[PDB]
Amino acid sequence: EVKIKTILSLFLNINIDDFNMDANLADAYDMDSTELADLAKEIEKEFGISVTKSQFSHWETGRAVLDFVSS
């Protein structure tokens, strides 16, 4: 959704138009473990659901974060 895409755009400092939802976060956008932990904290803030280290480790791309919050 638009609420997810705006966070990943702001956190990685990419243009929201140019940002790809299917692209790898670690490889393409050189995302580190601290940024992934910071992303997971704001998923807990926005949606209001429990997120642990085992769960957000599998968030490989911008579509993986959308598939989790649906469940």
Partner: protein, 408 residues
């Protein structure tokens, strides 16, 4: 003109033991000082359930200042220094810290905001609260007590601050500014803000365990983070000539010091460990000692995935094929991680190890890691003749720090 630096006094407040005698006995036998704690999981909801405590409602106990005064008193009595021997102009202090009295600052903030619910009430701010924000409370208080008139400093370089305080203290004595120097570090980070900060970062051990003492296991395949701890280490450094004239007992010679930056990441450490390897090399050039004489290493050993592999590959790069024989240990397996204080406490332990020609073990060694394949002295220690000792430290902002200690 350059003068040799020697350790004449030791003072320690650690979870393994308070005082030199109690501290040594526990680390000798390989007894864990790690305690299980309940207020982390129940109140705040931290995955961590282990801390290195020495002895839920918020309290400003001023532990950071307390541990510094206690360790300094023990160190000065051990050195056998008295007003007659001490020349104020040639005697300076260097007590380091990573967060200083953060507990007092956190407690002050929540008190004035009434449990962090409302805005800050100006009227509730007490006159005594300003002392909590003073980073160099430990340095100035000790300097006041024993009349230190030479340079008083507070190095706050994270978890490398301990060795950096010993480093600047060594420079003062060597280049002829000071005769005596009280050096070390004090840390009191067992507060929700400090523990929560690392917890949120994911640097603390979070794996489910039957025994919480095993949560800190350096160079083990099971390791998943460092067990946070509190305490203080104080070393009385002074000139070789100054110590001999008053007939002082010498623990070990502090031969050389070096410090570098990773230029890689703030918290993450690289696998190759080239930066740490360069720091060890420059420390040996500074001490004017050959790497061939190095037969013991007091490693940082936080028990994180990235730190232990970094140090192992760093030692492998400098020594090479000769690295495998050398006993390497981490005190954080028993004490946990006291940040800046851990360098000083391990530096006190290192001085006792060289004196007594004994090497303390790395306890909680479970499954051996294929990557970490050096001698880590697992579980049981032994008598070992130490000639030239290395002491590796690492902290945030990619800071590596090494000191070279030597037997006299």
């Amino acid at each position: 003109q350059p003068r040799r630096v020697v350790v004449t006094g030791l003072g320690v407040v650690a979870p393994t033991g308070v005082g030199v005698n109690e501290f040594w006995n526990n680390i000798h036998n390989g007894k864990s000082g790690v305690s299980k704690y309940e207020w982390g999981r129940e109140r705040f909801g931290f995955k961590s359930g282990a801390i290195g405590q020495v002895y839920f409602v918020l309290k400003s106990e001023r532990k950071y200042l307390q541990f510094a005064l206690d360790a300094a008193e023990m160190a000065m009595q051990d050195a056998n220094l008295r007003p007659s021997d001490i020349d104020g102009r040639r005697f300076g202090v260097a007590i380091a810290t990573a967060i200083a009295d953060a507990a007092g600052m956190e407690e002050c903030l929540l008190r004035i905001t009434k449990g962090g619910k409302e805005n800050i009430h100006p009227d509730l701010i007490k006159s005594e609260d300003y002392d909590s924000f003073d980073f160099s409370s430990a340095a100035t208080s000790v300097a006041k007590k024993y009349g230190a008139s030479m340079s008083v400093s507070n190095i706050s370089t994270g978890c490398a601050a301990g060795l950096d305080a010993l480093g600047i203290a060594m420079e003062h004595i060597r280049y002829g500014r000071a005769d005596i120097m009280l050096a070390g570090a004090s840390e009191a980070p067992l507060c929700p803000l400090s523990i929560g900060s690392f917890e949120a970062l994911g640097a603390l051990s979070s794996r489910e365990l039957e025994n919480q003492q095993a949560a800190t296991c350096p160079f083990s395949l099971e390791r998943d983070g460092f067990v946070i701890a509190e305490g203080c280490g104080i070393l009385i450094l002074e000139s070789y000539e100054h110590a001999k004239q008053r007939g002082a007992h010498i623990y070990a010679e502090l031969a050389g010091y070096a410090s570098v930056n990773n230029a890689y990441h703030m918290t993450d450490l690289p696998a190759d460990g080239m930066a740490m390897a360069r720091c060890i090399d420059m420390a040996l050039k500074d001490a004017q000692i050959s790497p061939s004489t190095v037969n013991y290493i007091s490693a940082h050993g936080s028990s994180t995935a990235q730190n232990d592999i970094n140090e192992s590959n760093a030692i492998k790069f400098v020594l090479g094929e000769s690295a495998f024989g050398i006993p390497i240990n981490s005190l954080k397996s028993m004490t946990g991680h006291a940040l800046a204080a851990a360098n000083a406490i391990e530096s006190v332990a290192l001085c006792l190890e060289i004196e007594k020609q004994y090497v303390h073990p790395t306890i909680n060694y479970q499954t051996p890691d294929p990557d970490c394949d050096l001698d880590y002295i697992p579980n049981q220690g032994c008598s070992y003749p130490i000639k030239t000792a290395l002491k590796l430290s690492s902290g945030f902002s990619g800071i590596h720090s090494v000191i070279v200690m030597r037997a006299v």
